[PDB]
Design a protein around this ligand. Structure first.
Ligand SMILES: [Cl-]
Length: 314
């Protein structure tokens, strides 16, 4: 009897130990665009040394022109508008803001903030219903109230920032719509592989999208969670493309590399190590799901299939 199967390790952590304690500044708004902005129309560039990949390797671009996806970090409303404008030049289809953040976040006086708990796990273990409920309550509770908004220091603790009496509160959905983008939330926990719940939701959503739909994925940094879903979308829309080509091309356009590599972390970040290994295994497990379920149109949901074909630990 296994308590937590591969892909659900995070379920063993205690939520009560990472509760939110401060409104974190998600972006200073000094740049015109969010950080790590990238699209599937972008040219591939040299891989990052840390991933020890083959720089001479030329990944196939098959299906990238019609992939129509992009990724980025969190953003201010103005930055989102700039993103929408840039994407509108590439498509005449609906542009979706796919919010992959489980952590409660929103905008106070137009400032992008999030209720930060240690490890960014303020909503760990909560269902999407509970997470959004927490988010809605906190945002509203901030109106006409004094709050402290601050960026984090090297040890993930408040550093400087500012104090203000909020006069306007907005959800990301509001910001997205005001930017001319449709909105879709997937409460994925930061630093770990998306839950079976997260993926089932995405998969159902993905199946009903128009042919010309453009997906702009984003999380906090625009790296871990953002790349995982960009990778999954790439595999789903281009099942004939090898796992290697998918992983390489998603990384070389500016994303994270989800294949094996010499994982290295500072002592204070040693806790992230097993979660990185788990994601590597689950990336391969999803690829297997796509290859073995595409033929019948994915009649079997990911969560169901996963239980029938559990991934092997690392
Ligand atoms: Cl849920």
């Amino acid at each position: 009897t296994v308590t937590e199967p591969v892909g659900s390790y995070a379920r063993a952590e205690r939520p009560q130990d990472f509760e939110g304690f401060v409104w974190r500044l998600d972006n200073d708004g000094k740049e015109a665009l969010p950080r790590n902005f990238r699209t599937s129309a972008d040219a591939l560039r040299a891989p990052e040394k840390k991933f020890h990949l083959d720089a001479a390797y030329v990944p196939s671009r098959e299906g990238m022109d019609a992939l129509h996806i992009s990724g980025s970090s969190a953003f201010t409303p103005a930055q989102l508008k700039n993103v929408a404008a840039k994407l509108r030049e590439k498509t005449a289809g609906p542009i979706y803001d796919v919010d992959l953040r489980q952590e409660s976040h929103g905008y106070l006086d137009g400032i992008p903030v999030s209720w930060y708990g240690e490890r960014d796990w303020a909503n760990l273990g909560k269902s999407q219903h509970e997470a959004l409920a927490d988010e809605r309550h906190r945002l509203h509770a901030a109106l006409h109230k004094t709050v402290y908004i601050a960026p984090l220091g090297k040890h993930k603790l408040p550093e400087g920032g500012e104090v203000r009496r909020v006069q306007k509160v907005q959800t990301e959905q509001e910001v997205a719509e005001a930017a001319g983008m449709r909105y879709f939330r997937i409460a994925a926990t930061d630093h770990v592989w998306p839950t079976p719940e997260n993926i089932d939701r995405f998969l159902a959503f993905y199946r009903t999208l128009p042919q010309d739909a453009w997906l702009h994925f984003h999380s906090e940094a625009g790296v871990g969670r953002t790349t995982a879903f960009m990778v999954m979308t790439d595999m789903l829309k281009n099942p004939s493309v090898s796992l290697k080509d998918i992983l390489y091309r998603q990384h070389e356009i500016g994303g994270f590399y989800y294949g094996e590599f010499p994982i290295k972390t500072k002592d204070k970040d040693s806790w992230k190590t097993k979660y990185y290994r788990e994601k590597i295994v689950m990336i391969e497990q999803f690829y297997r799901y796509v290859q073995e379920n595409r033929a019948d149109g994915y009649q079997t949901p990911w969560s169901v299939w996963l239980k029938s074909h559990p991934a092997k630990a690392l």
